[PDB]
Design a protein that fits this description.
The complex is a heterodimer of chains A (189) and B (233). Chain A is mainly beta and 189 residues long. Chain A contains 1 helix and 16 strands. Chain A has 2 domains: 1-110, Immunoglobulins (Immunoglobulin-like, Sandwich), CATH 2.60.40; 111-189, Immunoglobulin-like (Sandwich). Helices cover 2% and strands 49% of the residues of chain A. In chain A, the strands form 3 sheets. In chain A, strands 2, 4, 5, 9, 10 and 11 form a 6-stranded mixed sheet that branches. Chain A has a 5-stranded antiparallel sheet with strand order 1-3-8-7-6, with no helix packed on it. In chain A, strands 12, 13, 14, 15 and 16 form a 5-stranded antiparallel sheet that branches. Chain A starts with a strand and ends in a 6-residue tail after the last helix. Chain B folds into 2 domains: 1-109, Immunoglobulins (Immunoglobulin-like, Sandwich), CATH 2.60.40; 110-233, Immunoglobulin-like (Sandwich), CATH 2.60.40.10. Chain B is 5% helix and 52% strand. Chain B has helices at 126-132, 188-191; strands at residues 2-5, 8-12, 17-23, 29-36, 40-47, 54-55, 63-65, 71-76, 85-93, 96-99, 103-108, 118-122, 134-144, 149-155, 158-160, 164-166, 171-174, 177-187, 197-204, 223-230. The termini of chain B are far apart. Classes of the chains: A mainly beta (189), B mainly beta (233). At the A-B interface, strand 5, strand 10, strand 12, strand 13 and strand 15 of A face strand 5, strand 10, strand 12, helix 1 and strand 13 of B. The structure holds a molecule of 5 linked components (NAG-NAG-BMA-MAN-FUC) and 2-acetamido-2-deoxy-beta-D-glucopyranose. Residues 3, 5, 24-26, 70-72 of chain A line the site of a molecule of 5 linked components (NAG-NAG-BMA-MAN-FUC). The PDB classes it as immune system. Keywords: iNKT cells, TCR, glycolipid recognition, innate immunity, immune system.
């Protein structure tokens, strides 16, 4: 039975929104509690260290609380940025006795002021007849369909930033019949 | 200052695997963790100083060794599929953990399914270019196993990050086959220039030198596989 539990388990929030993560534990000793952030395929980065029976910390957009009586902690992220997309771990205790929670997966999605959804077919010049579909510039609430067919594959939405932002998904199939129009059932094929 | 090696490893069930951690922090404490979905990081073994080690929370099937202040090794004497995971080592001074970059380990029943990706670069749609004055190139890596890959884009010989979106996880296409996709978006003007060179590269981490390869087909060693295109007006 795990001794550190976190909520939400996962959440997808719109950029600029605040969010609150929670952790509670049954582990003793609990001299310190820490929150860590882990990006896609990255190492962990320490966000804050809480130590006192009732404690409160501030680190830029992060603020955190600790109530050792309740064995409870919260981490508040003010005004989320896309770069806040990551897993947040609560870690209780020290050194060899430290225990990690299973994490909260946070995803931050942008507001697209002017979506222009379009589906494009692209060709691979190194393979005769090899193509793929690109669904792009759709709004952030739009549902990208999952494959209902064998030999056809559709990726999850991927958010791209040129440094405007664009949502995109890709699909490919080994089926003679089916084209880009029947795969992405939104508009502009 | 905390360096793990190897960063990727493919082993066969019953084989031996050693992961090494070398730190330059002069920290007395070191730690080996594994990360698994639904478990966060779990401590396997740790050490409070050169010459000794301690069992962590899930030590079974692993040994550890701390021959010096700098080095902390994790030993799997008889690898099992259950040991497939991402491993992190860390050093510690005064409570804070300093983590290594991570090691992907896959323990397989046999090495015959290990296979590098086929990489394809799909060129931008003329409709996208005409209508949005932007050009999205798509790279697709297919047919690889296990999923120890890194996809990167190179424009004019330099790695690029802006305008790139890569799948954060490879998609399992079939039981022994993964896929991964990525998009690079540039302005139409940039795509339209003949000087510009675009390359999608996939670093596939596979078998090492000591691995037995009993086939007529090429040994699936660690390798870079790329596809490229040139701008055109
Ligand atoms: C993390 O915290 C949760 C929530 O618990 C609260 O928050 C913490 C910080 C403390 O302040 C607690 O005192 C708070 O209650 C814990 O879950 C709770 O665990 C306690 C036991 O420690 C449970 O209490 C039991 O409840 C039994 C009846 O439960 C049923 O009915 C209630 C109706 O309200 C329902 O909510 C519940 O789902 C059951 O169907 C009771 O018979 C028994 O005697 C005892 O009082 C409590 O029910 C739990 N709450 C919930 C919502 O499930 C976690 O255990 C804690 N995790 C860790 C690792 O510490
Ligand atoms: C592949 O490319 C990377 C980065 O460009 C390079 O550092 C690495 O050595 C290459 N891998 C192999 C096995 O050649």
């Amino acid at each position: 039975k795990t001794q550190v539990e976190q909520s939400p388990q996962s959440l997808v929030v719109r950029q600029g929104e605040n969010c609150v993560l929670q952790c509670n534990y049954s582990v003793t000793p609990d001299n310190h509690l820490r929150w860590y952030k882990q990006d896609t395929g990255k190492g962990l980065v320490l966000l804050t260290v809480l130590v006192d029976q009732k404690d409160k910390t501030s680190n830029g957009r992060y603020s955190a609380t600790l109530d050792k009586d309740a064995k409870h902690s919260t981490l508040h992220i003010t005004a989320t940025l896309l770069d806040d997309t990551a897993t947040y771990f609560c870690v209780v205790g020290d050194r060899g006795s430290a225990l990690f929670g299973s994490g909260t997966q946070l995803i931050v999605i942008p507001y697209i002021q002017n979506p222009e959804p379009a589906v494009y077919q692209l060709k691979d010049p190194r393979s005769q007849d090899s193509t793929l579909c690109l669904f792009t510039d759709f709004d952030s609430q739009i549902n990208v369909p999952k494959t209902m067919e064998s030999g056809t594959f559709i990726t999850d939405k991927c958010v791209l930033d040129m440094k405007s932002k664009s949502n995109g998904a890709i699909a490919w199939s080994n089926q003679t019949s089916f084209t880009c129009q029947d795969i992405f059932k939104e508009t502009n094929a | 200052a905390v360096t793990q090696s190897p960063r990727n490893k493919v082993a066969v069930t019953g084989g031996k695997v050693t992961l090494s951690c070398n730190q330059t922090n002069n920290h007395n404490n070191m730690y080996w963790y594994r990360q698994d979905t639904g478990h966060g990081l779990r401590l396997i073994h740790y050490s409070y100083g050169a010459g000794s080690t301690e069992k962590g929370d899930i030590p079974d099937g692993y040994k550890a060794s701390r021959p010096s202040q700098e080095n902390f090794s994790l030993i799997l004497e008889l690898a099992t599929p259950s040991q497939t995971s991402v491993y992190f080592c860390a050093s510690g001074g005064g409570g804070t953990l300093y983590f290594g970059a991570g090691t992907r380990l896959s323990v397989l029943e046999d090495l015959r399914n290990v296979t590098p990706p086929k990489v394809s670069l799909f060129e931008p749609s003329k409709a996208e270019i005409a209508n949005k004055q932007k050009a999205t190139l798509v790279c697709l890596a297919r047919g690889f196993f296990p999923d120890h890959v890194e996809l990167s884009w190179w424009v004019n010989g330099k790695e690029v990050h802006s305008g790139v979106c890569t799948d954060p996880q490879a998609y399992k296409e079939s039981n022994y086959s993964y896929c991964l996709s990525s998009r690079l978006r540039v302005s139409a003007t940039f795509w339209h220039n003949p000087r510009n060179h675009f390359r999608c590269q996939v670093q596939f981490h596979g078998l090492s030198e000591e691995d037995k390869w009993p086939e007529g087909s090429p040994k699936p060693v660690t390798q870079n596989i790329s596809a490229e295109a040139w701008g055109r007006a």
